């Protein structure tokens with residue numbers, strides 16, 4: 001069963017699915033090292049209001065470029081980017097590009113904050129396999145509220161070599177972002193804050209791309225859906241159902257996970273997806289012409305995998321209204337062979353063990369909280385080592401989607417105390433988040449490479465994360481390793497810290513924001529060659 005909705009009654013499935021706009025670079029800067037162009041962006045973090053409930057008041061948000069989701073980046077492999085994330089808001093931020101093997105000082109270390117009235121330049125490599133990344137806040141102990149209030153957006157890394165696959169295409173056309181969130185609203189339509197919540201903030205209103213229970217008109221053909229669970233605490237068990245047969249799950253194909261394409265499409269009628277996980281789905285509406293297809297969420301706390309509270313309407317995600325015919329023929333396909341997945345060389349070494357539970361009210365990793373500076377560094381791993389980590393949730397009363405920064409990993413095994421599931425077919429490839437459901441233990445395998453530095457790992461339930469379920473590992477190198485490692489291993493390195501800005505120089509695009517100043521700043525950053533070790 002389920003619990004009565006708390007948020008005001010919403011006009012279900014009446015508002016079109018919005019698509020976040022593509023974020024365009026301001027300019028490009030020539031890299032003196034290799035003559036390549038670096039794309040430079042400016043993102044302004046600022047407050048804004050959004051009228052979510054038509055007949056009530058508005059909600060207070062804070063977002064990248066004053067929208068939520070933030071605008072969508074689209075970057076081809078091989079093009080380095082620099083993003084100046086400008087804090088013109090009211091609380092600190094720390095931006096993490098989730099899915100990117102960024103250097104430690106460009107990775108969103110929780111203490112590596114930018115204050116209101118400052119910005120930080122983030123230098124990204126964009127060398128990894130094509131994948132759906134996302135960028136979001138990571139500031140220590142205020143991550144849940146910063147993300148909740150709007151600081152998360154999509155970042156698509158593209159590969160022209162994947163074009164020949166002829167998958168459904170066109171951002172906002174047949175390649176649709178599906179960013180899920182779960183929130184709660186007050187009686188006059190503002191957001192209920194996550195502040196004060198120490199267990200989980202489930203939310204009773206399901207959003208896609210910032211919009212409660214939307215609809216979309218689709219043609220009877222194939223669409224690529226890029227699912228991201230950007231919720232604070234809600235995990236999903238997604239399925240598609242004709243409204244005439246609301247319990248009957250319709251088949252689809254999963255084609256990609258966190259780190260990129262699967263080797264082969266996974267035939268799927270139920271998609272488990274927890275916080276921070278990305279799955280790309282191809283759904284074929286051609287068998288459902290003139291029907292309405294509802295994207296729904298499995299009840300009973302994601303079919304017994306989770307512990308999430310279910311409400312009146314959290315079994316509903318959005319509705320697809322399928323036309324009777326196409327307007328152009330569908331020439332897209334879903335190849336049986338997608339890519340060769342670059343799995344790490346397998347090891348037989350005993351896995352490191354990490355236990356995710358609670359120590360009193362505080363969510364901990366092996367009994368440690370992230371606030372504990374003395375004890376939070378829980379592993380030293382020489383760069384280039386392949387390690388298995390055993391990620392343990394002994395509890396039946398909570399679940400944890402675990403995220404390890406820097407790496408892509410393979411999911412080796414999952415056990416369940418409730419015998420509920422093992423490794424899912426769509427977990428066949430490479431991932432960077434893995435869901436420890438009720439009484440589940442998962443072993444992952446990862447190459448801790450290619451860059452040395454101190455990095456985070458944590459549960460990505462943002463309430464658990466803030467209080468205080470995060471730890472660090474150090475990917476280590478020897479004194480003679482080179483690659484300017486000495487200025488790239490410490491995430492708090494002063495060279496890369498946030499800088500104060502004057503609002504007027506930003507608006508006037510002068511001073512610190514003149515073409516010359518941005519150019520010289522980026523060329524100087526490029527000279528340190530932060531990502532050279534990936535080009536061996």
Ligand SMILES: *[C@@H]1O[C@H](CO)[C@@H](O[C@@H]2O[C@H](CO)[C@@H](O[C@H]3O[C@H](CO)[C@@H](O)[C@H](O)[C@@H]3O)[C@H](O)[C@H]2NC(C)=O)[C@H](O)[C@H]1NC(C)=O
Pocket residue numbers: 377452453454474475476477478479485486487489
């Ligand atoms: C994470 O691992 C890093 C190694 O990859 C480590 O950095 C290393 O720290 C040691 C000790 O501070 C440095 O060794 C030398 O440091 C000074 C400077 O010359 C000397 O006076 C000392 O006697 C010692 O020989 C290494 O230079 C340094 N290596 C790099 C690449 O920076 C970090 O300390 C680790 N971070 C943690 C534990 O938080």
Ligand SMILES: *[C@@H]1O[C@H](CO)[C@@H](O)[C@H](O)[C@H]1NC(C)=O
Pocket residue numbers: 482483484524527528529532
């Ligand atoms: C390290 O950074 C300095 C300063 O930008 C640069 O001159 C040098 O070429 C870099 N060395 C390596 C090995 O990246």
Ligand SMILES: [Ca+2]
Pocket residue numbers: 497498
């Ligand atoms: Ca400072």
Ligand SMILES: [Cu+2]
Pocket residue numbers: 096098136276403460
């Ligand atoms: Cu993340």
Ligand SMILES: [Cu+2]
Pocket residue numbers: 096097098099403404405406
């Ligand atoms: Cu991450």
Ligand SMILES: [Cu+2]
Pocket residue numbers: 356363399400401459460461464465469
């Ligand atoms: Cu958790």
Ligand SMILES: [Cu+2]
Pocket residue numbers: 096138403405456458
């Ligand atoms: Cu993180």
